[PDB]
Amino acid sequence: FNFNGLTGTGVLTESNKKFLPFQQFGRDIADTTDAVRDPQTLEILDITP
């Protein structure tokens, strides 16, 4: 997957996280992206290698 230039690798699943409208990226303890919004559609996605 490649969202807005952010390369990654894993499976994209539906996420129940509730992002505020002004947030786009979620991170874990190890500073690794785990949640991201589709630029075109406003649903939230979960990332897991």
């Binding site: 952010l6 390369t7 990654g8 303890i29 190890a30 500073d31």
Partner: protein
């Protein structure tokens, strides 16, 4: 019979054995947390760089 109550008296009775697993989880947690440091580089994300 006293042994039954003495063990259930205080939770810290197993301190000599509890610290073994706490130290292992403590040191391992810091190892993954250290991955967020950039070590003077541009960023801590190898995929992005």
């Amino acid at each position: 019979g006293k042994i039954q109550d003495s063990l259930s008296s205080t939770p810290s009775a197993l301190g000599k054995l509890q610290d073994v697993v706490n130290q292992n989880a403590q040191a391992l947690n810091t190892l993954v947390k250290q991955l967020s440091s950039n070590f003077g580089a541009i960023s801590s994300v190898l995929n992005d760089i």
